[model samples]
Target: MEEVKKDVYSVWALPDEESEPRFKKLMEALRSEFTGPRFVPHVTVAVSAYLTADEAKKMFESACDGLKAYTATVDRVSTGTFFFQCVFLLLQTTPEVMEAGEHCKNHFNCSTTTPYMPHLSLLYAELTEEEKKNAQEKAYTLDSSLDGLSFRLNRLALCKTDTEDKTLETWETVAVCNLNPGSHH
Candidate 1:
């Protein structure tokens, strides 16, 4: 039998209506300095290594079934290495969100070497320390009151990508699972 190639997919919890504009503004500001493709603001539930479409969809459906909507807060703005990961909005790890992510990991049979940290990227670009500082300053100026910013995550999406890098230029939504009210798994 020939070996099958698997494509990368990420399960994301997208922002609600109220939080959408806020995230978009930050991303737009970041884009002014860091040149990269645009993407929806999301909190990743799990990043699958490589999986056939059917396999990815099956796992995604299983992970999203019975998942209930939950709220999460943006705790802070921070930076990381790499262009696409330069600056991001860190989220508080609410139990409901964590549980949903943990379920996804188990269903997908995937594991990460590092601890799971949820964030929504504001920009994508490789930058020097000075550049990162500048971006952070801009972020702070835009929304210094990030501590209690909250949003509802009512759905999970299966998004496809050609590469494992953070870029979402090629990201396409393959499927979505809605977390209906009163549903729990």
Candidate 2:
């Protein structure tokens, strides 16, 4: 417990390959507009403070055991008050999404009182009210198809995330667990 760096590792639900460009373009636009780092578009599943890279890989594999690809529905483009939650796609509280997130949280033993509000962050930076509004409005105008857009959550990635590193220079993928064990490519 003492060796763990306190929230150093995070699990993320990756969007399907076919659905990447839209989110990537959105991320790039927001990051350029607000000067945030470019990271792979993902819906964070859970964070584990007690796992190292190897331990996180093991834990990720165990958590993903017997899991299958599930659908994630985006509810809307929204803004938040914090850096990490600045601008994101708020997802509906679908039963499958809750089940996957909760299952992994239990595996990592990092469950929080926070009711899971699944979101795919578009930008991670501090923004004023007007800037946040601009980001949200821009997201809507850029991707009018985003409303009610849903994609398969087919992969979970174990990332080396030091939240303090706002630049995300060292936020790299340690391992990936395919929920659909038999899927090609």
Candidate 3:
């Protein structure tokens, strides 16, 4: 079997059993407005940094070293922008989660922004005010539960969002890093 290729936007360490149905509805709405692929639910540790398969693999591997896994809860719904047109969800971060984000930013050539603002997006760019309002209203009302959502941060992979085809995909684990529980401080 051939492995799938991904043109990742940012790294998303997904929580298990997310509100899949609700999330799907949000993504579908986003697809209708945005011109590109609907990105998956992920907390972006780093983004806008380009990398090849070998490079991404090597970097991910190196970063995962000494990584400690943790979980967080969502208390509210937040929103932010991509440029001027694009908007997205911004999940509040726990201290532990921030530490993991710092690890990726400090160690890799990815975005240097620390204490990352976590989120699962509902839309990208190209939406009217009414559309944005409607989307946000609906998304905010959706239930948040850790049903099937659990992602171990021992590894990172490369993924992509295709603008033309409107699809988001992952290539492979460009790198794998071990979570260091002892380093949690």
Candidate 4:
């Protein structure tokens, strides 16, 4: 299903349903306290796609083919200086996660731009540097298990994003491609 084309598309590695509730809770809590749009929990795999929605979905499925689900461990709660990266849980760059990220980035021709930063964002908004720091620290107090939380990444979603829209009202999920079904260590 092709929606209106956008300038940029993001491919997200979504946590398995069983592991999403806590992340959602934390996201809602953060967004409520700080005020931001509601977005699904995801570890951004690629944000460099310059293709139409159909092409992104097609490439997404191809990139994900034959890959099995793997665990992503949180390195720490961190912050950045932009709308999308304001605050997040930075995942450790273990072999499995890095390899998966590289594979997808190569597929999307995203490596030519900025390298992928695997983060599960909790809030997307314009906040002061101090507020960003406070949100980073507050994430831990809001959820003790997030210190080293790990979850299986089982599906990849192709999402259309209008980056210029600060409210994210135009962000929408275009399609979801499941990784090959299998258990991982």
Candidate 5:
């Protein structure tokens, strides 16, 4: 089967309206210091290998068809250098969120070589241990509790990026799955 070549990155995005505006402000501030393609704030769910556009679309549709909605909560902030290049803001996920992440990973055949430790990248640059500590302190000062942080996992959005530029420019709805509702007391 012929596949359209596309740059892909998948994520379980937060749907908090407040976060959007706040993130925009943060991005604006970061722009003054750094210059690179600004990746809108999102928690990656999976990252697929380069596939043709059609193949990616088909995979997205298939994944969406099999997905169900799920909810997640950020308990606290931690730091890690998974890529050994940049520090990430690790978000704690509930058990259900872990299961949901697994489901998506399986469906998408995401990178299974490493254990999935969900996190958000604050800065994609090298930082010494001391620098990381300082950055962490400053980050916490901005939002210690990460207040106004909550998102409903409702749909899977497929996105495409420029291969050379590595910038997201297109997005397509792969599926709309609802999260499992919790039982009320």
Candidate 6:
């Protein structure tokens, strides 16, 4: 039998409806600053290398079952070097969020060479340091009180996309799992 390769999928921490509008507003304000494809505001939990849809769904569900709905705080607005990582909101690393990520990693056997930094992207653009600095300033000008903004992360999803890049146009939700509020395990 020939070796079979599966499709790539990205798991996301989908925000609840109450929180979506707020972040959407922020993302809209920074829309022009981004050059990449538009995407909904979300914190990425894992990017799976190659997994069948069934396998991905199972792992996503398992991760959700082991986690609980938790509050995540946006510490600040910042900029990164790459387009996908450009202007974004840095999230406070709470134990619950970190544990949730660990569960996803364990179930999917996903690993990253770089440390996992939780963030909800507002803009995805490739810019120089000077441009990044300017973008950062412009972002704060739009809303400076991003530091204490917090929201509840109640859902996780396995999203299928054509590329590994952070383009939302080709992304589609394959399955979604709701976190159990009372389930500690």
Provide C-alpha RMSD values for all models, in order: 2.7, 3.3, 6.6, 3.3, 4.6, 2.7
* TM-score, per-candidate, Cα-based: 0.85, 0.87, 0.61, 0.85, 0.68, 0.85
**lDDT tens string, model 1, 13-117?**
877777877878878777787556667888887778778767877888777775578888777788988765678887788787666667546654675654777
Model 2 lDDT per residue over 1-185, tens place: 54554347777888888887778988888777676778898988787775654666667778767456788888888888888888988998888887777754565368455677789888988889898898887778788889998989878887888767887887888888777765677
Candidate 3 per-residue lDDT over residues 111-175, each given as its tens digit: 55444565555566545666566656555444344223333333343444332332234322333
Q: State the weakest 10-residue window (summed lDDT) of model 1.
A: 103-112
Could you tell me which residue pairs clash in candidate 1? 83-124, 83-125, 83-126, 84-124, 84-125
Best by lDDT: 2
Candidate 2 has what TM-score?
0.87
Alpha-carbon error at 59 in model 5, in Å? 1.5
Runs with alpha carbons beyond 4 Å of true place in candidate 4: 1-7, 183-185
The window of 10 residues in a row where model 6 has the poorest summed lDDT is 103-112
Model 5 lDDT per residue over 66-142, tens place: 54555555554555663222444465667655665674466646666756666555555445667666655556555
User: Considering summed lDDT, which 10 consecutive residues are worst modelled in model 4?
Assistant: 103-112
What Cα-based lDDT does every candidate model obtain?
0.75, 0.79, 0.50, 0.77, 0.53, 0.75
* Clash totals, every prediction: 5, 1, 24, 0, 8, 0
lDDT of 1 at 121: 77
Q: List runs of model 5 lying over 4 Å from the truth.
A: 4-14, 26-37, 82-85, 147-150, 161-185
Point out where model 6 deviates above 4 Å: 1-5, 33-35, 162-168, 183-185
Give candidate 6's error at residue 16 in angstroms.
2.4
Per-residue lDDT for 152 in model 5?
A: 57
Estimate the TM-score for candidate 5.
0.68
* Residue 91 CA displacement from its true place in model 6, Å: 1.5
Residue 98 CA displacement from its true place in model 6, Å: 1.9
